[PDB]
Amino acid sequence: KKEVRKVRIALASPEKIRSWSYGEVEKPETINYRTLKPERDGLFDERIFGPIKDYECACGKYKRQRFEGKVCERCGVEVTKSIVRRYRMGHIELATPAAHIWFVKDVPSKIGTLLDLSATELEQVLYFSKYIVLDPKGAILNGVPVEKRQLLTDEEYRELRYGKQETYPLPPGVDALVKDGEEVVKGQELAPGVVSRLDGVALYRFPRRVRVEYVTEPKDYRVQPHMNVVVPEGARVEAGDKIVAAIDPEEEVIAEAEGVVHLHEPASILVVKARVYPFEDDVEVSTGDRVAPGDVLADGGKVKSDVYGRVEVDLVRNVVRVVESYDIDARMGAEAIQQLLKELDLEALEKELLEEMKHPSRARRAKARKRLEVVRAFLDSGNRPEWMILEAVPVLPPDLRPMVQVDGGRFATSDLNDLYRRLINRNNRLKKLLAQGAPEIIIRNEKRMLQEAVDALLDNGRRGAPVTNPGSDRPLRSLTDILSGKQGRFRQNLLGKRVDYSGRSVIVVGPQLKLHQCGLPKRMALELFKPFLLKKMEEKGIAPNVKAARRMLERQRDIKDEVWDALEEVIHGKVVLLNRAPTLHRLGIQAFQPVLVEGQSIQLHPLVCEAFNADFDGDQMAVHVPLSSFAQAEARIQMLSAHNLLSPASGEPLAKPSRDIILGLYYITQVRKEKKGAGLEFATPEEALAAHERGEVALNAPIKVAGRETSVGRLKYVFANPDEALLAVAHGIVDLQDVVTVRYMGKRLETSPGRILFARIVAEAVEDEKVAWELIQLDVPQEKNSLKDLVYQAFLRLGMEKTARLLDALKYYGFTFSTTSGITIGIDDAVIPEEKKQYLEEADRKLLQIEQAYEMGFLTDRERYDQILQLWTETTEKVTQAVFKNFEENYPFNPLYVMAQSGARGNPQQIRQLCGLRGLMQKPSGETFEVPVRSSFREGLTVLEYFISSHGARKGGADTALRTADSGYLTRKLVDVTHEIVVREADCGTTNYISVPLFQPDEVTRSLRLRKRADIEAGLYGRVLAREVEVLGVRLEEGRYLSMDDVHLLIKAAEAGEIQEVPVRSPLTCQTRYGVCQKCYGYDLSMARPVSIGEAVGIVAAQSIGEPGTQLTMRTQGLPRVIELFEARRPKAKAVISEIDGVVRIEETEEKLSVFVESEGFSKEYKLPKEARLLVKDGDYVEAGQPLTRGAIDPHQLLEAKGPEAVERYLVEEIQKVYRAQGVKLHDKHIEIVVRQMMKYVEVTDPGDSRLLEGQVLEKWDVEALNERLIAEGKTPVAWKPLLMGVTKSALSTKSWLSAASFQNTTHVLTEAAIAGKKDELIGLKENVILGRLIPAGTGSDFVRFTQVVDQKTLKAIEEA
Amino acid sequence: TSDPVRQYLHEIGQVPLLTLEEEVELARKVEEGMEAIKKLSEITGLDPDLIREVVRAKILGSARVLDPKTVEEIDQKLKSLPKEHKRYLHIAREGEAARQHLIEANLRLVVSIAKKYTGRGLSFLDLIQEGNQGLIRAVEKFEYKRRFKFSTYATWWIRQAINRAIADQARTIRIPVHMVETINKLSRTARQLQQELGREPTYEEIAEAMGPGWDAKRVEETLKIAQEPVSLETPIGDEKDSFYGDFIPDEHLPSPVDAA
DNA sequence: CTGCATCCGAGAGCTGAGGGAACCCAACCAT
DNA sequence: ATGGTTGGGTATAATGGGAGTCGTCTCGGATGCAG
């Protein structure tokens, strides 16, 4: 079995389709209504598709194996596996050709582009509304000759094909002014109330009476509708001959004597355009024959035709009449379209279009290029264009369109069966109607119905009203519906599957677990590891055989004790995967060692909850079991929870103390402050001690002794070592929060026993006293940021194993000290400051003033509204400050204050709402109310205030609800655009780089101000130095990975003016194909070390960008701004930039304003609305691409003006602005990867010596390679310009048709790939996932997956050999 | 452009109707054309249907796709025949043209009849086409000598064709015509019994009301085989994510336990 | 002759869980 | 040799259908306007 390496998709010929089929489906029957067996020649026939039962024919003659390939003579069913019923195809032979709707309705149409037909013309011809001309045969329409590819209506064709033959009903009992057989010109009145309009002969129809003379006297005979006249007008008669034959023999009119005959009172007159020819003998051409000028008609050739027309030999008058017509060949429908398609010569069309591509007109060139794309795709692929018209329709195997008996005895079927039934019925009816010589109206209607049936089968609900099953409004599900959508094959069954060896349950906190452990229920574990348990039971004496073990495990009450010990032995060392939906980043799946527990709930470690975004209010998680050694090794080494301690997005610790742990550590590491003493003066320590004993000074009061600040606690209690201090704490002498003097590490520290205990906790966790002393910050309370810094430093200095030990110790001690600290929440803990009351009255003062200023005309409505809003905003800020000042001064251990300051829970705004006041609220229109909510949540709101706040509450909820969906869609698009980017080599060898700046221009343009430390860290940490840097006597060599210490050193040097920017490698300048290299990426942020070769950094980047967007980024600004930037949309608030360099000259009139940029060569002009705001001033200097107005810059204009690098930098900075506004940490590398994919394409301006076309968009790498080869050969290089497209258009333009088809726009991608005959080389991850292969990343990368392992003894034996 | 019913109605309405004289004239032409066909068959000694096909092919013209070579050979095999006994061929050509005209003119009666058969499992256009087939049969069999109007004989054939098509094609599992009639009679009887009783009748009452040879068990079997299959794509729940076929397990392939 | 400018139509909007209407008559292959 | 199934037939006259749906947003062909 050869390995699969490429997948090709192409058009299928009728010959190919007929070679696929095992037989033609001739009948619409599915199964018999009595025996429920397939009907012969039906949609389920065993003769075509295969037997239902394994190795058994339909009639039962053969029911055993070894007969493979043998076909039973009676029933015709092959003897083979029944599974062939899901592989073997059938076909339907159409009576008339039908067009494949994919190549008709996908704009722009492939068939329309090939045949130069618009969509309207194609629709008119294909669905039998207009004719199209092939071989006109010298016909004349309205004086203009008819030419090929001309569209005629039904009227025009009917006139040209047959002629003009009008009929006029003569009123009853009125004779005509003209005689039978006389030429009539247009306008010549034929009756008192009839006027002719066409030229030609007039012919009597049903004369009401006949006058027969007799040798003389006339006589009259009445002619009723039920009888006919035989004798021609003006023909003598004999005695006994009949004239007016009738149905009844007694009613017949026999002429009595010899006389002339005349016919009068005609029922109607038929005026035709025709030629006439009498004859006196046998004629040659019969009715319905078409003749040319100068052809034999009758009289042995004496008479000859003079015009083109159709011959009708009227025997009544013994005259041959040639009605003016032609033999023009105009056809309708898919038959005509196919005939046009097969006559097409692609090489001549290519030459014609290449000649057309030289026009000075740009639109003409674009149209010729668009046609040439399709022409060249057909020429390259080898596909024939006529294959776009179907002659045989393939039939899906029955097992993929099953008709099954439900458990209740009823039948369930697929909609495809009904679509096929309709197609077969219409085809059979068309065949019958054709075999019957039916008129052309019926045949045209039937062919239209057949085309519509084919369209409905292929793509229902696309043209016209969708086909539905009677009694319902539900559209039938076509093949296109099966393929595409969220519920389609790609997204529902190929990119994601339901799996075995999996379970689900509610999660419960697991505080006693280690970092790498999870609590798994016993019953869940028994079900998950069942085959392993059966094997272990076989090894032991629990069951004689595997079947007995299974039967024993089947019933609950049949399970014993030893099976649990066997299970405990089964899972020893193995890990399981825990997953919480939604999986926003890779940390949403983690590996844990299962500890078997009782009950039904999974026990989760507290420190992974932040990574999972999991709480304990009903959350559920799924459990999966990796089976083989490779899977277990990958889970234990790469996906172990204890091995994943740092964020892949920012490099900061992700498993860290939080909530109660932080609370306990902060409680033990905070120091008391007391005011009883309040800076008293003492001369000797004994005086201070005596004062404290007397009760005049608190233990921790800040007193001054001998000119130095101290406290009574520091002098009174001096401990020899930490053990003595903690023993004194155990005896109630001092508290953990009192400041005493302790001798530790050979020094005398003025600290608290709690901080000493924290130091000991860290030292005993890391098993190293000096390093732990180096890591910790002793003189501050331990809060979120300090603990995160400690975790990061411990990681760097000691490794993840010791970091995990430290994390477990911190968790345990934090929980222990939070339990006994005495943290609680009462109503009085929401302390209301007194100042608030004052602050309110003051506000109630100024408001009155404002009203005065509005009653005297000094204020407008807008001004007064803004003044009130400003006043209330400043009052709210003052109340916040008062609340927190009260907490800091009077209740430093208050629960809300401690919770907010330690970072455990709460932010200042929520605390202000609890204590001070809620504040201003927004109306649903978005505008603020005039009265604020002056009550806090402790005081209680009124009904009106509650209702007013409900608007904002509801708006926030709806915001969340829409935002989550928009962020999910954005994340999917990013994954689709970056999924192929992998770290593929150590070094691409490039010398290009980017310059990360350290100073940004000020918003007031005063000077360059140093950027924030977080931004510099996000842009510099982990990167590889492109060039050597000398700063502060320190030489940072080229090729150095920038650690956090190096970044801090660079920032310090920038603050001293030694450096203004840093040159670094980046993915924006990497030269690696379908990925990046190790040097251009830098650190693996989750390990703080250089990234390994084989890492799927594109997926990591997409997840890193997408995770915060969900919920974090609010919703020009917020998530819409990020989406607009990633899609390169032109802003609606667009600003004005300068395309060229020059000086600024503002020209303003009282009616308009404009800005002139005057360079040394040229002076350009920019007209802008007067109300806008300008960033420039008269007499200033502006560079190319610099803005002239406020607002968002259009990226495409910036690309035209400055170039690619500037646009990359703008996109990265603007995307990072939104995330920084929310406080989200995210490295520049991920956005750089996405932008690098965004800027992947170029457009050809001049082809030079290449086969490319002007304006043809293609990948930048491919054109660079083409230019390199062209230069090697010595030709003229291709000229190109860079392009910028959003993530959607970049992803849909990839080379791999599988990933693009599974992403979006499935029908367009598939039809283009099939036309081009594209081959998918399986480069990215999505294609390999679809094919179920090993992805080219991680352990499946070619860099590592061929590694071998061997011991020394075996290696030496091979060496001797 | 779209809505093929309107397009078909427009194309039928472009053809004017007929008066008594024209209708009787065309019918007489058809009859004499068939008689001429038979006379020419006797004269040449060949099969009548094949010469009928040659006349039809010549009238329909090259535009309509037995092959051109064969029909051409027989066409000149007939031109050789001398006068007086040659008229028959011209009469046959004329009669075939008259048949085409008659069908084109009477197409509208098919629509008028078929418009009251919607909602029985066949779309309007399918009913119209089957009515057209019945109209062609009626045209072939019509006898104008009886002085009856054409529509009187055409309506019966149009109804028969529509009913036969409904009985043949309305169900995914084909049920024979007699059984379909039995099902329709059973349903109508049940509806009458419910109308009389004021409630859904029991199977024994229906069996009594059908007549001899009917018991409740047979009624039960008839209702069982009259059940129409349901769709595997029937949506379950409000969201468009769950289908019926998602809840149906495969019972054919052996399970991993069974294979082991 | 070109160009831009509204205009129309076509393709999208997170995951996971649970959710169920005529009747008759006669010849002819199948079982 | 029996039931189940299938093809053929009915003669006053009949002559162009019917349900439906108006609370979304963004982007790429295209007909229309001007110069």
Ligand SMILES: Nc1nc2c(ncn2[C@@H]2O[C@H](COP(=O)(O)CP(=O)(O)OP(=O)(O)O)[C@@H](O)[C@H]2O)c(=O)[nH]1
């Ligand atoms: N994929 C989705 N997950 C959702 C959706 N709604 C809720 N959820 C999940 O349930 C979680 C509900 O979060 P909650 O509202 O309880 C708030 P959270 O614990 O994040 O914050 P705090 O209230 O500050 O403790 C949310 O974080 C997701 O993990 C949804 O529409 N889609």
Ligand SMILES: [Mg+2]
């Ligand atoms: Mg929560």
Ligand SMILES: [Mg+2]
């Ligand atoms: Mg929750």
Ligand SMILES: [Mg+2]
């Ligand atoms: Mg002491």
Ligand SMILES: [Zn+2]
């Ligand atoms: Zn057999």
Ligand SMILES: [Zn+2]
């Ligand atoms: Zn590189």
